[PDB]
Amino acid sequence: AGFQLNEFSSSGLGRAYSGEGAIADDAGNVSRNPALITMFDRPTFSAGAVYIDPDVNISGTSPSGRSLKADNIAPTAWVPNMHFVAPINDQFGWGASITSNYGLATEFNDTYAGGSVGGTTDLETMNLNLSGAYRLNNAWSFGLGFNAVYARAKIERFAGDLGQLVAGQIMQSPAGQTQQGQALAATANGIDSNTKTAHLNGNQWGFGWNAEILYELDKNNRYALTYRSEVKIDFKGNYSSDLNRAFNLPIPTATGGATQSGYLTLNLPEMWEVSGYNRVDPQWAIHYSLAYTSWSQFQQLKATSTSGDTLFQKHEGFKDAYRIALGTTYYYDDNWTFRTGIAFDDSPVPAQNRSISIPDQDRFWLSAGTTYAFNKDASVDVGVSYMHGQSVKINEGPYQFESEGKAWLFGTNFNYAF
Ligand SMILES: CCCCCCCCCCCC[N+](C)(C)[O-]
């Protein structure tokens, strides 16, 4: 998953988010799978957070001989979640929740030789969801939900050695000797590492909806199909570039540092997910899922000026991708519950499109969790998950890098009910 997040509950973390639309042992699940609402016969609560500790690294050498060693470019994060589910009557119930389905944060040193293709990239996302559900009969249930997505993002790029590279090019071609071509490679080579090559930031809201059909063969077996609509966010922020208005080459529009309104449309992929849950035995349940995310909808990142011109652009060309997950839950005794999960979700970025801003790659999830219930009305969820990613090669601009990533997740949630 590119800039997607799966941390909506601590229970799901311990089970590697496998079959999340077919399980409902705690309120956290109905946040992304509405129909599960008809699985609760009483007001239920849950709140907590997942701490993410990534270890992402970039390596390589610039044509300028300088090092492209970006060490630990992914900051640690806390992704909170909060859930409420309540029955209206015997046929209807609803739910509310706050979670985060998208996010990203990559930051290099502004003196990094790769400044032009990697400086600072941040995307914070908050999703407010109000849902409702209807239970046709003992087998079928229907869930509808509306979402309010808030997103704050900030992109800033610099110039690593581009000045030295272009200046070195201007001094290798015939136009080198020219007292004009040299006063050109003296200016180019002049630009410092930390020279804000671009700056975009802004906040905005997007809206979307959910639909799920839950089918249960019985009290111990059910399967489900859920639709998560795409969400477009039309930002309206601030753009600028410290490069002299003169420089206006495949460079972002220079504004001599001045700021001007900027417009950008972020496309958050829609999602389809089929899942099942099998309570094979009084104490064991098996849960699995396949998720299809159409990252195709995220074709680019283009910034427009009020006038309509392009101030900043970056091709992304993402392809739809799948996430596969298998896990099991051990309902030990009235007090203890244990869970494991393994999962694999392949990155939607084609090798040809990879960039150091989203050091993304195929991922392996291995996870474990436990749940202590204090009395059937209160419980705590503790989950842990290990993430390791495929190491890949990146060709961006004149540079060539190589990145690898691994991450650890710890999460805690407290549950309550009446
Ligand atoms: C006018 C400002 C518009 C805000 C620009 C915010 C873009 C957030 C996109 C995050 C995706 C990260 N990526 C593609 C750059 O690696």
Domains recognised in the chain with CATH numbers: 1-418 (2.40.160.60)
Choose one of 301, 356, 361, 403 to mutate for the ligand 1 pocket test, by most ligand atoms within 8 angstroms of C-beta.
Answer: 301
Computed on alpha carbons and rounded to an integer, the radius of gyration of the chain in Å comes to 24
Q: Which helix (H) or strand (E) holds 155?
A: strand 140-157
If you ran DSSP here, which 8-state letter would residue 102 be given? B
Residues 21, 27, 33: CA angle, nearest 5 degrees: 25
- Can you tell me the distance from the alpha carbon of 155 to that of 318, in angstroms, rounded to the nearest whole number? 19
Closest residue by Cα to residue 37 from 290, 277, 212, 279: 212
Choose one of 56, 58, 100, 104 to mutate for the ligand 1 pocket test, by most ligand atoms within 8 angstroms of C-beta.
Answer: 104
**Ligand 1 mean position, distance from CA 327 (Å):** 34
Nearest CA to ligand 1 atom 6: 153
| Cβ neighbourhood burial of 296 (10 Å; 0-12, 13-18, 19+) | middle
Residues with Cβ within 8 Å of 133's Cβ and at least 6 positions away in sequence, in order, are 30, 34, 35, 36, 37, 38, 92, 93, 94, 95, 141, 142, 143, 144
Q: Which helix (H) or strand (E) holds 183?
A: helix 182-188
- Is residue 97 a contact partner of residue 82, using CB atoms and an 8 Å limit? yes
Closest residue by Cα to residue 190 from 166, 208, 212, 207: 166
* Ligand 1 atom nearest to 3, measured from its CA: 11
How many angstroms separate the Cα of 406 from the Cα of each of 6, 344, 360? 16, 13, 11
Residues 83, 84, 89: CA angle, nearest 5 degrees: 150
Q: Are strands 198-216 and 231-240 parallel, antiparallel or unpaired?
A: antiparallel
How many CB atoms neighbour CB 231 within 10 A?
Answer: 24
> Collapsing DSSP states into helix, strand and coil, what is residue 28?
helix
How many angstroms separate the Cα of 279 from the Cα of each of 9, 35, 341, 346? 21, 19, 16, 28
How many angstroms separate the Cα of 155 from the Cα of each of 199, 200, 210, 316, 331? 6, 5, 30, 15, 46
> Collapsing DSSP states into helix, strand and coil, what is residue 63?
coil
- Is residue 181 a contact partner of residue 175, using CB atoms and an 8 Å limit? yes
Residues 230, 236, 241: CA angle, nearest 5 degrees: 120
The experimental technique behind this entry is X-ray
* Ligand 1 atom nearest to 262, measured from its CA: 1
- Can you tell me the distance from the alpha carbon of 119 to that of 141, in angstroms, rounded to the nearest whole number? 47
**Ligand 1 mean position, distance from CA 168 (Å):** 31
Task: Write down the residue that tokens 């392949």 correspond to.
Answer: 346
**Ligand 1 mean position, distance from CA 106 (Å):** 11
**Ligand 1 mean position, distance from CA 4 (Å):** 13
**Ligand 1 mean position, distance from CA 396 (Å):** 17
Tokens at 123, concatenated: 């995307």
Tokens at 409, concatenated: 């997740």
Q: For residue 175, which phi and psi values (nearest 5 degrees)?
A: -70, 15
Residues with Cβ within 8 Å of 82's Cβ and at least 6 positions away in sequence, in order, are 46, 47, 97, 98, 99
Closest residue by Cα to residue 34 from 22, 48, 46: 22
Q: Identity (one letter) of the amino acid at 200?
A: L
Q: Identity (one letter) of the amino acid at 203?
A: N
- Can you tell me the distance from the alpha carbon of 392 to that of 306, in angstroms, rounded to the nearest whole number? 38
Q: Are strands 300-305 and 310-315 parallel, antiparallel or unpaired?
A: antiparallel
How many angstroms separate the Cα of 96 from the Cα of each of 22, 140, 148, 313? 19, 22, 11, 37
- Can you tell me the distance from the alpha carbon of 295 to that of 130, in angstroms, rounded to the nearest whole number? 25
- Can you tell me the distance from the alpha carbon of 381 to that of 13, in angstroms, rounded to the nearest whole number? 10
What is the number of alpha carbons within 13 Å of residue 365 lying toward its C-beta? 28
- Is residue 330 a contact partner of residue 283, using CB atoms and an 8 Å limit? yes
> Collapsing DSSP states into helix, strand and coil, what is residue 66?
coil
Closest residue by Cα to residue 266 from 227, 225, 236, 308: 236
- Is residue 18 a contact partner of residue 327, using CB atoms and an 8 Å limit? yes
**Ligand 1 mean position, distance from CA 195 (Å):** 19
* Ligand 1 atom nearest to 201, measured from its CA: 2
- Can you tell me the distance from the alpha carbon of 103 to that of 96, in angstroms, rounded to the nearest whole number? 21
- Is residue 70 a contact partner of residue 112, using CB atoms and an 8 Å limit? yes
Partner residues linked to 106 by β-bridges:
121
